[PDB]
């Protein structure tokens, strides 16, 4: 029940950044309590500057901040995902499945996915710019 509340806290937080995802990510308006404002669809900025309420949500914020710290690009993508995991977990709780089981399941799934990431990854050619292979790649990513 308290677990479900935490889940709802993190979930409700994730619900907001659901819309700020990807290119068409909708804006979020941050009110700097000093009597100022800044708007953005950026996960980092939002999660950082926002003054979060619930502890669980604060922990999710913490996770996101770590996620940003390690690398800049993906931050919201993590939060939305976390929210999705919890939302899918609360459906298994209704199946009367103890949290620890779900946790282990998620761990295994994570490890397997982590293993599968490179398996499904397309390695590139970085052997010089003489060839222009790198340029085409760099052009695509650009």
């Amino acid at each position: 029940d308290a677990l479900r509340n935490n889940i709802l806290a993190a979930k409700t937080l994730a619900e907001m950044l659901r819309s700020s995802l990807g290119p068409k990510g909708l804006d979020k308006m941050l009110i700097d309590s000093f009597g100022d404002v800044t708007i953005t669809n950026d996960g980092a900025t939002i999660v950082k500057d926002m003054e979060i309420q619930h502890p669980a949500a604060k922990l999710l914020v913490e996770a996101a901040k770590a996620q940003d710290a390690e690398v800049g690009d993906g931050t919201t993508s993590a939060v939305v995902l976390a929210g999705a995991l919890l939302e899918k977990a609360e459906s298994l709780l209704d199946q009367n499945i103890h949290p620890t089981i779900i946790i282990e399941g998620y761990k295994k799934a994570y490890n397997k996915a982590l293993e599968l990431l490179p398996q499904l990854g397309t390695r590139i050619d970085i052997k010089d710019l003489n060839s222009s292979v790198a340029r085409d790649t760099l052009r695509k990513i650009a």
Binding site: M16, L26, K28, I31, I39, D49, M50
Partner: protein, 89 residues
Amino acid sequence: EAYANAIEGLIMILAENAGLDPIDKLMQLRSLHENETNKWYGLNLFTGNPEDMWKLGVIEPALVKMNAVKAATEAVTLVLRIDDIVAAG
């Protein structure tokens, strides 16, 4: 289309503030502006009837109109782009 209507809203309100029937005058002007040669015709509020607004010295800077459109568009898009409001620090 909605944008166009929203623009016509200005003519309507302009008619309202003069104590005239909005829709009728809108329709009148719309009917008049089917002719290439009535591209200046607007609403004479004192007279009450549509008239060529250029001869009556009802002239305004294009830049003002453009800027108004621009800023209004920007404002509304900003309103629509924002999904939620958050307190920060």
